[PDB]
Subunit: 390 residues, 4 copies
């Protein structure tokens, strides 16, 4: 005998329903359909005994809008809990700060996001933490490289920007047998395509800036924890380091998450067609997209990717860095020559100009492409024009 | 041509316009999104260089609002666009601009309730004669045009009956009679119908609904087909001080980018839901342009592009009390509330919600029967929505 | 036996306390010290019978953040109720739309804000409403000019930009004896200096853009009603015309109202010193400020102005429009050559270039000055430099 | 020089800097306030023209945040400033930048609780030795400096004991020993004390408190005296991803304009309240720099400018239970909560609120007695605040 405002008892809401409504109910006070923005720093306590009786005290620790977004994200990624941060780098740094001490070993994918690599090497290594960067394409490599001091195995799939894949289920089985903490950066994937916590990962790190936002609008990070122990560790350290997400950013992201399925579907269809076009282009050397049949890790993509193969692709222009640069300089609108990725607006970039950067795969004129939701024919027209000008 | 430029001579296709139309990266910084000009006034370089940078006071115009207006004018296919705090403000500005004492205005009988009230309870006090006719037959509009008729205000689809109006034929009539044709295509969105392409002189939009699509902001838009009409709307907006804020314009610039995919999802869900309802035994009638039982299917196929929309309606067997039992028992993800066109599916019964004010006689005359229910379909999983509707109908 | 969160029974809180806290209590749900921003359009209803049981349904009609700001403003101005609008012009237009019909007469100060004058003449007169503009400096003039069709007496004090004063108590006595509705635009005054509702006015119109905001940040208007009848009329017509203030603007203004007393005190002290300096300046023809002893309506200023004489002044540069324009072009920072007024930033303007405009008093080179809260010596230095360059 | 330019060779005075410092009207539009760059990335003109407009990714830097940082560097008298999501983030970035395993850091014993915890519960795990000493005597700092000491972290006034530290003498000591002097002047604000003027190498601010002053946003600031220190802070902020958002920076750019008048009002109210409390028979002790009973009055008059601040403290006769009875019975306009420095007056008792965690022994050693109460004075009418305090003391 449920009424309006209640969910059907015994019904797990479907995926897109969760993206629309998950972790959010109408405001109890007013019935407001959207969460009010709690743009305030402190919360008045009713008494000394009733301290935190309403759950909040100070926004660096917790905020109702941020908490609503966290519950939504934990539900979307299938974790016990989630903590939101000012940036994705803040989330990664909070992971490294919480679960690594002097003497600890940490295995990181050698093709990780450049910021993750630089924060590990340039900063955290000063604390006598050993970061070893290996190829995660073969999970057996991860199994070999585990030492007794290994505390964290940090995977990324697909990797920024090489789009190399890591077998999250195999790596998670290895890590659970070896009793080492498995952290996965599924920013490029989005939970719509892959939920590492479903594949056995201990922690998921997300740059909500990318696809959670998907509108080039905010910065944010998320750490989704599978257990209460891990989540409490992360919550405590976030309060200590003061890198929590703001309420306004939480509101923006709560709005933009609702359309993540349709956004990612459109971006991925456009990306498939664009990668197919680039693979046929006489001016294009190599094309990297998990959806085209020549993808080297095709079997792992088909096993690990749900619904889509994503909006990220890459390609090499025949002619080296000079042809690549000429092409970059001659890409017209609606393409944008900038950084970031995962947004409605299609983005093109060249990490080589924006030895150490070829063993990764960021070769000469290696162009990274974030596909948006514009008309795919306009995107292909701009690409074709630029390629003919290369 | 180098990077950052559109290829000369080419035009962005539809969804490209929704993403990028009327907005370029910030010339000062390259910011891919337009900054939010949350400021009242603009410093002038000198007395002689007054307005040399185009701005002076945010009530008159604002850069964020202007970027949104360029986008909206591009999407709707008009010369210009002016943005307002609400859709009602856009309608009210139209009425205040183009009507005077002694003028005549043709309004669709099944117009949006707010339009009907604001014409009846307010502007009629200015000795302006408002006549509410059935716009379903363009000859009704043609016959009812007086020599004092200045504005013909169509709405398609209508709120909430979803009646259609032949915008092309009505525009032909108005052009031949030299009468302004204003069309409220809020329920249609420009992704399904652009009245300016069909000869309408003005389009009024409640950006609150689908332009937003997230239950986030209120807004309105007036898209003008000529420079003279646009200049009049601009002047009157400045005079009446009902411009849209820069924060709302930023929100709308964000949400408009996904309008095509949002509306495609809502329309697919609405088609499936209408087909489900047209076979439930507790349902007396189902209105959706995408099902064969639609009375104006010919006009719908002639006038609707891509989709048939995310709005539908249905009449429950059992009258008002059965409708109320269903409303009180419609579960989540549905929301019992007003507004429409959002990602969150919304259901309402105007009889005892929107029009618990109104007498039942002309409420039936205006089409809204007793068990009439308006349904805005969101982008949730259609199975959750259908299960909710089925349980609610079980309780009817 | 009151506890934390309650006010002392039988205590009317003092003025500055009302500016800080009036119309706002901690959020009942979370104890949040500031009102959450209800950035949502619709409000979910619990049932058909319990329609509007929580008070809200649609934001064009009403919004909790806007409602909180309205209660605060009604308390500050001493009225039964208040309605907030997108702009001050929207508030004035709502007044004219509600209380004027074809055939009605309306007395307006001839020195009213230019926007009020233009909306009355250019627009509302098309509805066969007669707007008569007379000199409100003598209340007897208002008494003479009242016809049987006069419905609204629309005063302004101080006037934009001539700073002419209108005797609100005398005009209100006249209007109450004649049974005509008295509306007052006290934007230049702020309730800290004058509350027309205390002086018998029927309606107060405020441009919250000016001093309520005081930070050049938002646009807004307010209509403060002395009776429930008037307030309900205004509320209904605001819902009809769709010119309500947004929740974000309400939040901004709720923040900026807290410092209105100290802001206006600082602006007014700076303005007094600046007007005294200008009155001694050999390059300055006339100086207009209600605080200097030569003010023509000095007695009315001392009778009607509380605490301060405001941050608005005006002056004429000796030499006509050419000297005025040279001075305007040679005013350095921190002065800003723009429009608007009442902000932290000091503003200078010349309405003559930014016959019909001299009977008002906007003479040749008539400079309007909005004084901010910068260091008064910097403001005087910039003015002195500009004047020597005139 | 024409309009819109500062007179060359002149410097704005204090309050002028608070209003206008480091911000000019928008070059594109003349917008008197800086627009809100609510955008993640910035479009580049070409490969060669990378960063030609100064921006690329908002985590690294953002135009609104940069305008706020210019303002803050001007106000505090530093070379540069970097803004963070919180004050704790600024402190944590300092610790992460300038400390390494085996390094030594001198921290005031009566430091802010968050600083104490983050040094003790986190960075000490990196084999960094944190020593908490009494900063009230600069010779204590001088004697305790090891050859491995890299940072000396002062706080003045201290939270919540309001102990002062001689920033000039400590800075002299640190310069002679070539040690970084970081000072947390959150409680002071630059309107009362600017540690960079007193030889400090770094100032850390919780902009949440007085910079905001409206209980609206969280933020932090690191103001660096040299280019090298500033560049290190900038690099590490980019690496740790704890930059301040553009909306928060806009709010803070708004609120900083009234910091002088706000702090003057709070300080006048605090003086009157301290004088009232120093004569209430239910009050055992009163700490405020502006009353004669202040233990460090000489340093206060030497080091405090304009005012003595809006923070005070007092110990109630009767112990913790009397303090709790007073806390539960302090009426509006007071608010029982955390945070400080806002327009709204705030009262707290760390013993059973902030430090219901802590053991009582070292909580007394760190100065906070049992009936200790911290009071942030707002800008309400001082009579309302005094009446509230008097009633609450009646209930003690
Ligand atoms: C962008 C990104 C990050 C960094 O997140 P920010 O919000 O920019 O700090 C980390 N990992 C991946 C894969 C990313 O794409
Ligand atoms: C919503 C609507 C309006 C009114 O717009 P508001 O934003 O609510 O003021 C007018 N016409 C239609 C068809 C509408 O749907
Ligand atoms: C500014 C002003 C107005 C107009 O208010 P807006 O917010 O600009 O629409 C009306 N009257 C006076 C006295 C004003 O100063
Ligand atoms: C508030 C404060 C902090 C912490 O700043 P947050 O914004 O709360 O992270 C650090 N030191 C002092 C003195 C403080 O008052
Ligand atoms: C009008 C009243 C809220 C609105 N557009 C609706 O249809 O609900
Ligand atoms: C720390 C904890 C909330 C904060 N700055 C305070 O002093 O309350």
């Amino acid at each position: 005998g449920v009424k309006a405002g209640d969910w059907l008892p015994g019904f797990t809401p479907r995926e897109e329903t969760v993206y629309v409504h998950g972790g959010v109910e109408p405001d109890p006070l007013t019935g407001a359909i959207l969460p009010p923005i709690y743009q305030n720093t402190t919360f008045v306590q009713e008494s000394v005994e009733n301290y935190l009786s309403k759950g909040f005290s100070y926004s660096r620790t917790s905020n109702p809008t941020v908490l609503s977004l966290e519950k939504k994200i934990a539900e979307i990624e299938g974790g016990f809990g989630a903590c939101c941060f000012a940036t994705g780098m803040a989330a990664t740094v909070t992971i490294f700060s919480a679960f690594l001490a002097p003497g600890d070993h940490c295995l990181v994918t050698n093709c990780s996001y450049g910021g993750t690599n630089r924060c590990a090497r340039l900063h955290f290594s000063k604390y006598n933490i050993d970061f070893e960067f290996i190829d995660f394409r073969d999970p057996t490599n991860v199994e070999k490289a585990i030492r007794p001091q290994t505390k964290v195995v940090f995977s990324e799939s697909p990797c920024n920007p090489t789009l190399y894949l890591a077998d999250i289920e195999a790596i998670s089985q290895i890590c659970k047998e070896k009793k080492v903490l498995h952290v996965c950066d599924s920013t490029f994937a989005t939970p719509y395509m892959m939920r590492p916590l479903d594949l056995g990962a201990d922690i998921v790190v997300q740059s909500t800036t990318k696809y959670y936002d998907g509108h080039n609008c905010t910065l944010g990070g998320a750490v989704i924890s599978s257990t209460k122990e891990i989540h409490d560790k992360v919550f405590f350290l976030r309060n200590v380091m003061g890198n929590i997400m703001s309420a306004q950013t939480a509101f923006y992201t709560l709005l933009t998450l609702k359309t993540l399925p349709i956004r990612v579907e459109k971006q991925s269809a456009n990306a498939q067609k664009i990668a197919e076009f680039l693979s046929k282009h006489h001016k294009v050397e190599h094309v990297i997209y998990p959806g085209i049949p020549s993808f080297p890790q095709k079997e792992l993509a088909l096993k690990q990717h749900k619904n889509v193969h994503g909006g990220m692709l890459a390609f090499e222009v025949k002619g080296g860095t000079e042809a690549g640069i000429r092409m970059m300089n001659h890409v017209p609108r609606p393409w944008s020559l900038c950084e970031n990725l995962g947004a409605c607006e299609s983005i093109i970039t060249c990490p080589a100009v924006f030895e150490d950067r070829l063993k990764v795969g960021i070769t000469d004129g290696f162009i990274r492409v974030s596909v948006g939701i514009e008309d795919v024919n306009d995107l292909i027209d701009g690409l074709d024009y630029a390629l003919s000008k290369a």
